[PDB]
Amino acid sequence: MFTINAEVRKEQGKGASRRLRAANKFPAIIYGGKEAPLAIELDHDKVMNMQAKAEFYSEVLTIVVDGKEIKVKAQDVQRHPYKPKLQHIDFVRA
Amino acid sequence: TRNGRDSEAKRLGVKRFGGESVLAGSIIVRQRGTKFHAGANVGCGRDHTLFAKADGKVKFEVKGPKNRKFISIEAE
Amino acid sequence: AKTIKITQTRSAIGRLPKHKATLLGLGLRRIGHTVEREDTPAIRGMINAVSFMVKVEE
Amino acid sequence: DKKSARIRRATRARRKLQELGATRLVVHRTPRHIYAQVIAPNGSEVLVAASTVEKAIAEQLKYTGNKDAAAAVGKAVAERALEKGIKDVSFDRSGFQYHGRVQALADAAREAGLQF
Amino acid sequence: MLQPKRTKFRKMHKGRNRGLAQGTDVSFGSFGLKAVGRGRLTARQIEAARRAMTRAVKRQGKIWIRVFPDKPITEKPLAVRMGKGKGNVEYWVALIQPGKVLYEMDGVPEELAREAFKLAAAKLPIKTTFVTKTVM
RNA sequence: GGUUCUCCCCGAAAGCUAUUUAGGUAGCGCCUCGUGAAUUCAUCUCCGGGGGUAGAGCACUGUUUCGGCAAGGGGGUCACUUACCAACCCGAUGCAAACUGCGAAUACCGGAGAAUGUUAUCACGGGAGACACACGGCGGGUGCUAACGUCCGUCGUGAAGAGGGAAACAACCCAGACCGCCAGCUAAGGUCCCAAAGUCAUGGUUAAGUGGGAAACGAUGUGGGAAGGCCCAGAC
RNA sequence: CCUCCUAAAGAGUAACGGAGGAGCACGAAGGUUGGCUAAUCCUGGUCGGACAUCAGGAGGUUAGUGCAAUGGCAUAAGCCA
RNA sequence: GCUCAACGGAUAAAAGGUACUCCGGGGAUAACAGGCUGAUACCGCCCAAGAGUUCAUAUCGACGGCGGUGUUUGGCACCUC
RNA sequence: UGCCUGGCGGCCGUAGCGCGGUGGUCCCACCUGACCCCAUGCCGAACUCAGAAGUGAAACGCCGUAGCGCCGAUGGUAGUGUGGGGUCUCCCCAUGCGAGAGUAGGGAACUGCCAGGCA
Ligand SMILES: [Mg+2]
Ligand SMILES: [Mg+2]
Ligand SMILES: [Mg+2]
Ligand SMILES: [Mg+2]
Ligand SMILES: [Zn+2]
Numbered sequence: 001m002f003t004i005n006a007e008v009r010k011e012q013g014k015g016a017s018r019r020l021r022a023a024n025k026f027p028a029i030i031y032g033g034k035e036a037p038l039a040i041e042l043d044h045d046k047v048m049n050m051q052a053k054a055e056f057y058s059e060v061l062t063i064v065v066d067g068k069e070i071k072v073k074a075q076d077v078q079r080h081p082y083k084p085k086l087q088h089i090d091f092v093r094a
Numbered sequence: 095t096r097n098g099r100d101s102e103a104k105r106l107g108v109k110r111f112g113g114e115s116v117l118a119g120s121i122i123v124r125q126r127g128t129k130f131h132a133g134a135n136v137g138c139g140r141d142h143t144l145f146a147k148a149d150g151k152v153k154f155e156v157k158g159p160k161n162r163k164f165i166s167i168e169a170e
Numbered sequence: 171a172k173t174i175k176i177t178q179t180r181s182a183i184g185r186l187p188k189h190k191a192t193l194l195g196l197g198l199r200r201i202g203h204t205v206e207r208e209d210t211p212a213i214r215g216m217i218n219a220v221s222f223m224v225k226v227e228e
Numbered sequence: 229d230k231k232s233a234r235i236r237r238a239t240r241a242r243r244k245l246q247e248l249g250a251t252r253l254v255v256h257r258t259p260r261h262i263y264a265q266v267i268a269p270n271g272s273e274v275l276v277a278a279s280t281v282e283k284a285i286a287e288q289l290k291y292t293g294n295k296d297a298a299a300a301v302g303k304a305v306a307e308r309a310l311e312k313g314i315k316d317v318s319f320d321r322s323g324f325q326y327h328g329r330v331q332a333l334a335d336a337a338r339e340a341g342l343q344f
Numbered sequence: 345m346l347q348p349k350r351t352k353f354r355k356m357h358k359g360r361n362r363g364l365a366q367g368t369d370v371s372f373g374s375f376g377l378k379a380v381g382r383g384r385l386t387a388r389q390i391e392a393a394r395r396a397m398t399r400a401v402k403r404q405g406k407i408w409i410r411v412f413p414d415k416p417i418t419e420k421p422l423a424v425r426m427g428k429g430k431g432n433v434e435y436w437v438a439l440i441q442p443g444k445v446l447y448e449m450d451g452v453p454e455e456l457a458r459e460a461f462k463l464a465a466a467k468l469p470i471k472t473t474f475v476t477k478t479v480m
Numbered sequence: 481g482g483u484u485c486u487c488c489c490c491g492a493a494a495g496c497u498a499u500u501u502a503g504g505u506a507g508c509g510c511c512u513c514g515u516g517a518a519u520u521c522a523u524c525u526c527c528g529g530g531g532g533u534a535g536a537g538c539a540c541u542g543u544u545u546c547g548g549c550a551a552g553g554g555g556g557u558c559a560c561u562u563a564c565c566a567a568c569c570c571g572a573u574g575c576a577a578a579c580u581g582c583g584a585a586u587a588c589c590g591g592a593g594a595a596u597g598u599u600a601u602c603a604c605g606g607g608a609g610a611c612a613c614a615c616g617g618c619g620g621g622u623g624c625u626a627a628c629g630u631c632c633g634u635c636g637u638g639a640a641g642a643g644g645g646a647a648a649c650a651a652c653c654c655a656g657a658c659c660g661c662c663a664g665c666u667a668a669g670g671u672c673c674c675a676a677a678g679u680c681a682u683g684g685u686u687a688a689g690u691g692g693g694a695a696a697c698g699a700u701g702u703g704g705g706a707a708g709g710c711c712c713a714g715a716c
Numbered sequence: 717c718c719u720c721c722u723a724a725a726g727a728g729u730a731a732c733g734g735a736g737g738a739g740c741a742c743g744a745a746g747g748u749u750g751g752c753u754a755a756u757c758c759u760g761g762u763c764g765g766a767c768a769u770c771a772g773g774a775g776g777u778u779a780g781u782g783c784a785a786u787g788g789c790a791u792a793a794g795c796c797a
Numbered sequence: 798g799c800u801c802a803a804c805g806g807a808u809a810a811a812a813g814g815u816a817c818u819c820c821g822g823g824g825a826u827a828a829c830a831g832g833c834u835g836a837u838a839c840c841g842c843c844c845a846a847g848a849g850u851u852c853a854u855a856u857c858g859a860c861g862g863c864g865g866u867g868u869u870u871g872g873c874a875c876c877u878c
Numbered sequence: 879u880g881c882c883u884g885g886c887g888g889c890c891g892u893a894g895c896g897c898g899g900u901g902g903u904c905c906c907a908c909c910u911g912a913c914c915c916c917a918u919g920c921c922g923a924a925c926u927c928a929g930a931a932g933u934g935a936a937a938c939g940c941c942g943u944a945g946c947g948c949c950g951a952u953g954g955u956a957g958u959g960u961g962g963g964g965u966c967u968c969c970c971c972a973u974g975c976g977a978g979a980g981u982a983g984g985g986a987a988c989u990g991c992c993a994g995g996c997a
Pocket of ligand 3: 934935
């Protein structure tokens with residue numbers, strides 16, 4: 001039911017990761033199944049409002065990226081240490 | 095309580111690293127216990143000092159079922 | 171290899187001894203010394219160490 | 229345990245011959261039979277093997293394992309060793325005492341002319 | 345007063361307060377008090393801030409302390425020259441990093457949690473903020 | 481305490497060890513000069529290495545919070561139990577220079593290779609000086625995560641370097657002065673005057689002279705961003 | 717004079733920095749050969765309990781090593797002849 | 798055969814006073830003072846259980862927290878022997 | 879060449895433990911007997927001798943099972959060399975290298991010589 005707009009990452013490492021967090025973004029990943037893992041960048045303010053409800057961690061998540069709807073599930077979330085922000089969210093294809 | 099003593103620091107550690115060609119009789123690693131174990135062409139001294147018994151290069155291996163470290167010498 | 175050019179930008183006074191030895195291996199002596207070098211990864215690794223203070227022209 | 233106490237007893241004598249690079253003669257003792265193998269110093273291959281479960285030896289024996297059988301198979305390994313010529317093998321007692329069939333298999337091979 | 349009952353050695357070096365915290369999420373209750381700034385919490389500060397909230401959250405619910413000092417600080421007294429060995433142990437401190445959950449509380453309303461954690465933030469020498477338990 | 485003419489080239493150290501030694505002196509490192517020596521040494525790339533520090537974790541060595549299960553002990557009993565205290569074990573959660581079931585960055589050691597450098601390297605010989613170091617960045621011990629405080633490691637400058645900038649200000653930043661010229665381009669740093677250069681262009685902020693010293697904490701100051709409640713059955 | 721940490725993942729590295737310990741013991745506690753495997757806990761039980769000694773089971777070096785501490789030790793460097 | 802233990806060990810053999818003092822120095826090292834620093838001291842502020850008949854802030858203020866002045870006791874030995 | 883078993887290895891937990899099932903012609907294991915060769919710091923348990931009545935129990939070998947141990951990414955985080963900067967007890971930016979823990983998942987080993995049995 002939850003639809004999240006996403007884009008594929010063009011770089012990797014903590015260098016590109018800190019540049020996204022200074023530009024109202026945060027990286028993520030989508031893994032699981034027989035498919036290869038895909039590097040995913042996400043808008044920070046959009047996910048932060050959605051994660052406040054308990055249905056964001058229980059129900060099946062839908063992600064529209066590159067003209068493709070992949071049904072996933074939230075597996076693990078990394079949060080900022082002291083600010084109420086997000087760092088990295090794990091996704092399992094289910 | 096009445097502290098302030100320290101001994102002379104004994105010059106331990108690895109003296110001949112891996113890949114180095116050593117002579118027969120040279121000291122590879124000075125040590126107290128068997129941090130390193132004797133292997134191929136390597137003799138163990140009285141104070142557990144591992145020395146060379148043949149001319150060749152130093153080769154470090156981790157063998158045995160107890161996952162212990164060894165020193166071997168391959169022929170150059 | 172093909173020829174590139176390395177020109178020193180800043181001085182070598184406040185540098186580390188590794189950065190001073192890097193400029194001696196690159197043959198740089200003063201600011202504005204333009205000299206030709208080859209584009210091997212050994213020379214390119216010397217450029218990567220002092221990239222804050224050299225100018226390179228491919 | 230019965231078997232594992234035999235293995236840890238021999239282990240000091242096993243790895244000592246590994247440090248010298250010599251060819252060892254191990255023995256396996258059984259209430260039924262007895263074994264003896266000449267092993268290369270790498271330890272992953274043998275060169276001379278002759279036992280009492282082979283029918284060539286058991287025909288001349290009243291019972292498959294005793295002091296008379298260890299004298300027979302001790303010679304039998306030693307005669308096959310002289311045909312190969314390993315010539316100063318080492319003796320591995322393999323966790324047993326040097327009193328009975330282990331001694332009988334060794335002294336029989338000493339009589340044939342092997343250097344141990 | 346929160347202090348170790350027995351240590352292997354009496355004294356300890358000064359150390360530093362570098363790095364990030366590891367006490368990120370509340371894992372005992374539903375409400376927490378997370379440190380924002382950087383510094384040290386002495387033994388008196390942890391004891392006083394526990395007394396500061398407990399007055400207003402009367403005897404129901406449950407309060408956890410997620411930290412423990414485990415670090416002594418020695419002092420050299422007045423009119424004493426430098427040297428003569430290290431001084432005597434006076435008080436215990438805790439190395440606190442930005443992001444450490446310090447004080448937790450469960451079984452209280454959310455409006456009551458905002459009051460008591462505000463009353464305990466003044467006793468702490470570093471800035472704090474209010475957090476709430478997020479699942480997973 | 482003082483040591484008197486000139487010019488050129490190179491150029492320290494304030495460390496270790498030992499000392500009735502601690503402001504002294506000796507050896508060594510470092511300086512100069514001379515002979516001799518291997519392609520020696522330095523830098524980077526790849527290869528061969530050893531790590532247990534930063535971090536992280538709580539299997540171990542210590543510590544600490546909660547819950548569950550509970551031998552035992554106390555009490556009640558005409559063999560059991562109670563509103564009692566509680567080890568070990570199990571789950572969850574921390575902390576530690578003298579904890580490590582884990583683990584870097586680089587640094588260091590060795591080998592090969594190109595480029596570069598006036599042998600920058602080692603051996604030996606002649607002559608030393610020095611062994612009071614300072615501050616700054618970083619890693620620490622100590623001290624109050626006070627000191628233009630002290631003691632180390634490492635790097636830089638000063639010492640032994642002027643010049644430009646930080647108003648002035650050895651140690652900060654830029655930059656190592658062969659000499660002359662009323663040439664130009666620039667570095668850090670600046671462009672309204674003192675005082676050389678934009679009263680430059682564009683998009684904003686601030687109205688306090690903030691800028692142009694200073695914290696916890698307090699406030700319908702204002703700019704920017706996201707999420708809600710109510711309302712053309714007339715909302716505030 | 718010795719051990720650990722300070723010591724910043726080689727060595728080296730200070731202070732009236734943090735914790736201890738040594739001026740020996742030993743003819744076996746040495747050498748060699750042959751053997752042997754603890755700590756803790758459960759259950760059982762003439763004297764017998766908290767322990768005297770055992771049996772099996774759980775457990776697999778947390779035991780031990782003439783002593784300070786670290787690094788070692790099962791092939792035992794531990795233990796016995 | 799040396800606790801030459803001050804242990805790289807000035808003699809086989811060694812305790813004190815000097816305010817009657819003296820010389821050679823030193824701000825390389827103290828006392829007066831400056832300066833650095835602000836633990837302490839002084840002063841101010843934040844949170845507000847409690848005192849104030851009831852009632853925190855009229856007057857006060859615990860447990861704790863953040864600064865200012867350089868003002869006491871100091872710390873340091875940077876100027877001066 | 880297959881199946882099964884023994885010996886010595888390579889390797890050192892993706893090779894272990896627990897649970898479930900199974901193997902006796904050969905093999906191995908227990909077992910039988912022991913005055914004796916010898917052995918016990920007491921003891922035929924071990925050691926060791928002489929035998930084969932009995933048996934797949936204990937142990938061992940194999941198969942099956944993901945309760946546990948273990949192996950273990952991708953991405954992200956912590957840290958850091960060099961350079962630069964800030965509100966400089968600390969942290970950020972440029973670039974280089976990349977954790978630990980945890981997750982997805984992998985996993986009931988693999989392999990060499992030789993001997994015996996069966997087909
Ligand atoms: Mg970076
Ligand atoms: Mg028997
Ligand atoms: Mg069975
Ligand atoms: Mg990992
Ligand atoms: Zn009032």
